[model samples]
Target: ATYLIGDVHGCYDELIALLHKVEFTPGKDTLWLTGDLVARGPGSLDVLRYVKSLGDSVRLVLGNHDLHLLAVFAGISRNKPKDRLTPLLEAPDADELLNWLRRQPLLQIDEEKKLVMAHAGITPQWDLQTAKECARDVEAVLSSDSYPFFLDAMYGDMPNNWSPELRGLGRLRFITNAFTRMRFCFPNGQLDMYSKESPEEAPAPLKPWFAIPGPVAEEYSIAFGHWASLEGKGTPEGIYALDTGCCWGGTLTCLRWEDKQYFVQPSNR
Candidate 1:
């Protein structure tokens, strides 16, 4: 059976406790992480080491913070003075840990279970294949020596909508926005990044990506994170949002696919 989990945000002890709460036996169960496994907490290094030790039992997606960690580590992105990720960057296993992280998929699908997992919400515009290809492009760059260059070009919001014509950094930014930082978008599919409020507070012209009447809800059971403000609540019926915000004193949540049972472990934050 598979258990899907939300953003861990470097709460290593809490993650271990949560796994224990679910009785997650490695051989008997698989864990699907919705990403953002590192950053913003005290144990980013420990968290990465632990998750890596889990090996194939864990499936991870890429989150915006994850990319930022890679960028900063590669010396392409500046380390914000207030950021708490330096410990992880300096860890003895940092290279190995980051390599594994760079290899993580941006999107995953299990046809047998009809499950579609992504770090951030997927738009209605692309099918699973297209989304996977887009993810691979970013992954390729992240896994290459040219990754620093890619990170250097990572920011911005131009070429806002999905289109085949988008090239270079614009394309990368578009994919990153969709798979990492996205929350709301205009009818024309332009992202609205400034609004971090709850979904209820979204502007009239903006709507959650899953609510966009797309193939995501109709074709697959979607699982995603990144909107911690939702507190794990989502609009689409078959869509599961796992970001319970453990770093913010919210409960860390997990779902067992075999029985559709839910489990939670309170965080000590």
Candidate 2:
């Protein structure tokens, strides 16, 4: 059986406690993470180190915060003077951790369980293979020397929807946004990035990614995070959201894919 987890946000202690509550055994069970494993919390470094030590037992996708951390370390983005990522930036294994993180896929699919794991929700425009291809393109750039260039141009909102005509950084950035930081987009596919409140409060034109209504959900069950304001509740049916805002003093959530059972561990903070 496999267990899927949501945005960690550097809540290392809570993650450990939640794992124990789920009785997660490395060899017998697999752990799938929706990413955002670090940043905006006290133990970003520790979180990355522990997860890296798990080797092949743990699977991770890339979240916006994770990418931002890499971008900052690579000198593609300037660090905020008061950011909490200094510890991770100065860790002894920082290089190793960055390399490992850069190598992680943006999406993972388990055919047996019919589960598709991604850091952000997928639009109906792309199927699983299409989504995988989009992720691979970014992964290639992230692993290349030209990655800094990509990161430098990573911040933007133009070319808001998926289109075959998109080119260069615009194309890459659009894909990255859709798979990492996206929450709401217009029916015509214009992304609205500024809205971070609960989905219920979103404007009339905006709808959750799963609401796009194409081939995404009809194909497989989707597991994702990055929307902590939902408090871990997700769309009905095959869509699963595990981010319970552990960094915000809520519980860290985990779900066993086999039985569809879930468990939560409270954050001491």
Candidate 3:
């Protein structure tokens, strides 16, 4: 079974208990972590260590916090006092852990089911193939021998519009933003990163990525995390929002993929 899950946001005890509560099997069932598996809680190292130790049993996509972790690892960003990443950053095998993090997929696609999974929503303009290819482009730079070059340039918000002609750091920045930072965006796909308000609080012409009718909305079933305010109800038909905000005093949500039913475990914090 492919059990899809929401953001962990470094709530390590919650994650461990949820895994046991679900009776996660060693090799029998696949685990898919939507994103943000680290930062924000004292357990950041715990979650990273356990999940990384699990090997192929898990599929992890990068969330904004996860990227922030990379930024810190790349020595491009200084730590905020509240950032709970120091433990993971100082672990004995820190390099190994960060290496594993960099190699993960940006988007996971099940072609037979026409299902797509990512940390956040994709651009409506992209078909599944284009989405996968765009992800590959970023993934190449993210995992490259010169990865620090990409990481050093990863932070930014400009040229928010996506164009087929976009090149260099702008392309990678757009991909990172779309995959990890998006919640609500303008009609032209310009992200409103500073607005954490729910869709109802958003102004005219700015809407949740799933609210717009496009390839992602019309074609495949999508599972994603990152926006906890939706509470999974932002879902419209085939679009599934799995992040239930476990790190923010809510529950850890899991989607049983075979039957497409949801199972939730309450917060342990």
Candidate 4:
């Protein structure tokens, strides 16, 4: 059995409590995370170690904050001097932990269960095949010696559009952004990094990415995070927005994929 959990954001104690509350079985139950496993909390160091301890029993996608750590590691961004992230950045095992973090897939699929997972949302423009390919394209960079090159080459946004013909860093940037920072967008699926509102209250031109529908997962489902405003509200028939904003005084949420059951650990922040 497998359980999909929302963003951890370095709240290590709550993660431990949530796992216990679900009666997590070390080798039996798979824990799939929505990433953002570190940052903005007291124990990014512990969170990194604990998840590493789980080894193969867990699956994780990289979130925006997760990438911030990587960028800082790559010298593209500076390590913030603060309680929330400084501890992890200065830990003795910082390099080792970051090594593990970068290797985490940008997108994941449970073929047996027909489920797709991303730290954020998949671009509506890609079908399953294209999405997987694009994910691998970025994965290749992050997993390569040239990764630092890619990291520095693309950092912010401008084009805000995806095109197969695009080469160099632009192509890679779009792929990574779609899987990590994306949320709402226009009808044509152009990237819009500005909005954080729920679908109903969002501006006229954009809507939740999942609400737009995609060619992937006809009878299957998508699970994602990155939008705490959603409060885990999404159409179960189509997608699951799992970020309950535990790091922001909201509950940590976990969903049992097999039965669609949920277990929660109330936010202690």
lDDT leader: 2
Model 3: number of clashes?
0
Candidate 2: list runs displaced more than 4 Å: 81-83
- Model 3 CA deviation exceeding 4 Å by range: none
| Candidate 1 per-residue C-alpha lDDT over 112-229 given as tens digits, one digit per residue, 9 for 90 to 100 | 9999888887877677778888989988988887788888788886666898788888899889888888888788667777888787988798888877766666888888888899
lDDT of each: 0.84, 0.85, 0.83, 0.84
TM-score of each: 0.96, 0.96, 0.95, 0.95
TM-score, model 4 to reference: 0.95
Q: Judging by lDDT, tell me the better candidate of 1 and 3.
A: 1
**lDDT, residue 42, model 4:** 83
User: What is the per-residue lDDT of model 3 for residues 138-228, given as tens digits with 9 covering 90 to 100?
Assistant: 8988788788888888788765767789898888888888888888878866777777777888888998988767676587888899998
Using TM-score as the measure, name the better of candidate 3 and candidate 4: 4
lDDT of 2 at 202: 86
lDDT, residue 31, candidate 1: 96
- The candidate, 1 or 3, that scores higher on TM-score is 1
